[PDB]
Design a protein around this ligand. Structure first.
Ligand code: EVT
Length: 39
Protein backbone atom coordinates (compact mmCIF):
# COMPACT_ATOMS: atom_id res chain seq x y z
CA UNK A 1 0.00 0.00 0.00
CA UNK A 2 1.16 3.63 -0.49
CA UNK A 3 1.10 4.18 3.30
CA UNK A 4 1.60 7.89 2.47
CA UNK A 5 5.13 7.13 1.24
CA UNK A 6 6.32 10.59 2.36
CA UNK A 7 5.16 10.34 5.99
CA UNK A 8 6.05 6.62 6.12
CA UNK A 9 9.52 7.54 4.82
CA UNK A 10 9.74 10.20 7.57
CA UNK A 11 8.67 7.53 10.09
CA UNK A 12 11.23 5.09 8.65
CA UNK A 13 13.92 7.79 8.60
CA UNK A 14 13.10 8.67 12.23
CA UNK A 15 13.13 5.00 13.23
CA UNK A 16 16.55 4.65 11.59
CA UNK A 17 18.02 7.73 13.33
CA UNK A 18 16.25 6.97 16.64
CA UNK A 19 17.66 3.40 16.42
CA UNK A 20 21.25 4.04 15.27
CA UNK A 21 21.21 6.68 17.98
CA UNK A 22 19.66 4.32 20.55
CA UNK A 23 22.46 1.73 20.31
CA UNK A 24 25.24 4.30 19.66
CA UNK A 25 23.77 6.77 22.19
CA UNK A 26 23.72 3.80 24.59
CA UNK A 27 27.36 2.99 23.73
CA UNK A 28 28.33 6.66 24.24
CA UNK A 29 26.69 6.58 27.67
CA UNK A 30 22.89 7.18 27.52
CA UNK A 31 21.54 10.09 29.65
CA UNK A 32 24.84 10.53 31.64
CA UNK A 33 26.59 11.85 28.50
CA UNK A 34 24.04 14.72 28.25
CA UNK A 35 23.16 13.61 24.71
CA UNK A 36 19.40 13.46 23.99
CA UNK A 37 17.41 10.18 24.12
CA UNK A 38 16.05 8.88 20.76
CA UNK A 39 13.20 11.38 21.20
C1 EVT B 1 7.40 12.18 11.28
O1 EVT B 1 7.47 13.39 11.16
C2 EVT B 1 6.27 11.44 10.62
C3 EVT B 1 5.06 11.31 11.59
C4 EVT B 1 5.40 10.71 12.98
N1 EVT B 1 6.01 9.38 12.93
C5 EVT B 1 6.50 8.81 14.06
O2 EVT B 1 6.50 9.38 15.14
C6 EVT B 1 7.08 7.42 13.98
C7 EVT B 1 5.99 6.36 13.64
C8 EVT B 1 4.94 6.22 14.78
N2 EVT B 1 5.46 5.56 15.97
C9 EVT B 1 4.73 5.56 17.11
O3 EVT B 1 3.70 6.22 17.22
C10 EVT B 1 5.21 4.73 18.28
C11 EVT B 1 4.10 4.52 19.36
C12 EVT B 1 2.91 3.69 18.80
C13 EVT B 1 1.69 3.71 19.77
C14 EVT B 1 0.40 3.20 19.07
C15 EVT B 1 -0.86 3.37 19.97
C16 EVT B 1 -2.20 3.19 19.19
C17 EVT B 1 -2.46 4.34 18.18
C18 EVT B 1 -3.90 4.32 17.60
C19 EVT B 1 -4.04 5.37 16.46
C20 EVT B 1 -5.48 5.47 15.90
C21 EVT B 1 -5.52 6.40 14.66
C22 EVT B 1 -6.96 6.59 14.10
C23 EVT B 1 -7.00 7.55 12.88
C24 EVT B 1 -6.32 6.98 11.61
C25 EVT B 1 3.79 5.37 14.27
O4 EVT B 1 3.98 4.13 14.20
O5 EVT B 1 2.71 5.94 13.95
C26 EVT B 1 4.12 10.61 13.77
O6 EVT B 1 3.68 11.65 14.34
O7 EVT B 1 3.54 9.50 13.84
Amino acid sequence: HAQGTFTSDLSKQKDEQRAKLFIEWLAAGGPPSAKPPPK
